[PDB]
Design a protein around this ligand. Structure first.
Ligand SMILES: O=C(Nc1cc(S(=O)(=O)[N+](=O)[O-])cc([N+](=O)[O-])c1O)Nc1c(F)c(F)c(F)c(F)c1F
Ligand SMILES: [Zn+2]
Length: 257
């Protein structure tokens, strides 16, 4: 099945998901000098105050924190978006070394990790129908830099031991995702895809300019997770990032001068 190793990694994905070679694939490198100020972009509207987190799951290539998406409780609007999108999950991708890990790059600079907050367009009724639509998903991408610890990440860090191996899940209530946001909400935006199978081209990407810092010891605990299931041989969960894909016929717009 697909993964991130030598024999089943991103260079092999096209064999089972030919959209891997499509026209609007993600991630991409963000060339800050050719991105375009768009003054018609509205500011982002992030409303996470009523968010209801449910649980945390090792799914064998990352770890997801899931949310109640049966009602408008944690929503994203504004920006380049038309309509309301509900938060369904967030996850991270990260590297084996501090100098790699992010999926998007900025002027070919790699960050230590990226946070992806996945939202779907309520217009379409359920998440399964949203992913079939050009404007079905909106993912908010946030870069992580190694520096001072991020307090609001620590509750995620401390539960990771209970979901070491693939398939394990733990109750994870009352987590507030506002602790993960940077100070500024300036961003770049472009149309893209999921970065993992099935790589559907259904995503409006919103990548924040400002990284958040986490400590060396927080990201170490990410790296002690396990791709394998319990009882299987131990593969450390690291380098679960897809390399940048050609921009082709797309333009990256910025919300800031
Ligand atoms: O990927 C899905 N969401 C998702 C997106 C991103 S991302 O594009 O934002 N990076 C990363 C992760 N992740 O956990 O790493 C994700 O789990 N849904 C999904 C699906 F719709 C399917 F039809 C399917 F067969 C399947 F396996 C699926 F998992
Ligand atoms: Zn992701």
């Amino acid at each position: 099945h697909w993964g991130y190793g030598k024999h089943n990694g991103p260079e092999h994905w096209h064999k089972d998901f030919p959209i891997a070679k499509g026209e609007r694939q993600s991630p991409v490198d963000i060339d800050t000098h050719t991105a375009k100020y768009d003054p018609s972009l509205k500011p982002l509207s992030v409303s996470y105050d009523q968010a209801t987190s449910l649980r945390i799951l090792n799914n064998g290539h990352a770890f997801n924190v899931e949310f109640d998406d049966s009602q408008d409780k944690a929503v994203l609007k504004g920006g380049p978006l038309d309509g309301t999108y509900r938060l369904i999950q967030f996850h991270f991708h990260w590297g084996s070394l501090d100098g790699q890990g992010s999926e998007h790059t900025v002027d070919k600079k790699k960050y230590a990790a990226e946070l992806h907050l996945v939202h779907w367009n309520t217009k379409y009724g359920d998440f399964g129908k949203a992913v079939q639509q050009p404007d079905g998903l909106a993912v908010l991408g946030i870069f992580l830099k190694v520096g001072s610890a991020k307090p609001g990440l620590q509750k995620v860090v401390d539960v990771l031991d209970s979901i070491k191996t693939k398939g394990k899940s733990a109750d994870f209530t009352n987590f507030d995702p506002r602790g993960l946001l940077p100070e500024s909400l300036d961003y770049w935006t472009y149309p893209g895809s999921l970065t993992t199978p099935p790589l559907l081209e259904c995503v409006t990407w919103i990548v924040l300019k400002e990284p958040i810092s986490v400590s060396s010891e927080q990201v170490l605990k990410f790296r002690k997770l396990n791709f394998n299931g319990e009882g299987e041989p131990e593969e450390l969960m690291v380098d679960n990032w897809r390399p940048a894909q050609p921009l082709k016929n797309r333009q990256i717009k910025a919300s800031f001068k």
